[PDB]
Amino acid sequence: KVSGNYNYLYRLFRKSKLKPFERDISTEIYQAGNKPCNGVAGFNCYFPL
Amino acid sequence: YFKIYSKHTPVNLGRDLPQGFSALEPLVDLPIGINITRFQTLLALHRSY
Amino acid sequence: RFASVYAWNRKRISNCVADYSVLYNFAPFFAFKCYGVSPTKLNDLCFTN
Numbered sequence: 001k002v003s004g005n006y007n008y009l010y011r012l013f014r015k016s017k018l019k020p021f022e023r024d025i026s027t028e029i030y031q032a033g034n035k036p037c038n039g040v041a042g043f044n045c046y047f048p049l
Numbered sequence: 050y051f052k053i054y055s056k057h058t059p060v061n062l063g064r065d066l067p068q069g070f071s072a073l074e075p076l077v078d079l080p081i082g083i084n085i086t087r088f089q090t091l092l093a094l095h096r097s098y
Numbered sequence: 099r100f101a102s103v104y105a106w107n108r109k110r111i112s113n114c115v116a117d118y119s120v121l122y123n124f125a126p127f128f129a130f131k132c133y134g135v136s137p138t139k140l141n142d143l144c145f146t147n
């Protein structure tokens with residue numbers, strides 16, 4: 001795309017390892033840091049996709 | 050490939066788990082691709098005795 | 099006493115024990131977009147300079 005093909009997403013942050021041959025579709029927020037993450041998505045919160 | 054090993058009984062006499070040997074014969078399977086969380090069952094609640 | 103944008107102020111860093119876990123509370127971090135490398139896992143990489 002001339003601007004960018006924003007149709008593909010890749011997961012970056014996961015809790016732990018991954019077994020062979022499974023899928024992990026989960027539209028969540030990464031509960032990092034001490035403060036309870038509430039979909040803030042700012043610092044200490046991360047959108048895994 | 051859901052395992053469904055099963056077998057019918059010829060000579061059950063109505064008592065809890067009679068002693069003996071009898072194997073099981075698979076019928077069919079199905080791929081799933083998910084992981085394990087819990088289990089639950091339910092019978093036909095429209096009639097029970 | 100930070101410098102200007104056209105003549106920015108540099109810094110050299112060499113053999114040192116680095117822990118990127120002390121700056122998070124020191125500044126508000128309105129913007130915390132680092133490079134594409136995993137921002138969460140930064141305490142497991144070794145470099146020469």
Ligand SMILES: *[C@@H]1O[C@H](CO)[C@@H](O)[C@H](O)[C@H]1NC(C)=O
Pocket residue numbers: 022023024025084085086
């Ligand atoms: C494994 O099962 C748990 C139980 O609910 C679930 O939360 C988790 O998402 C499952 N793993 C994957 C990779 O989906």
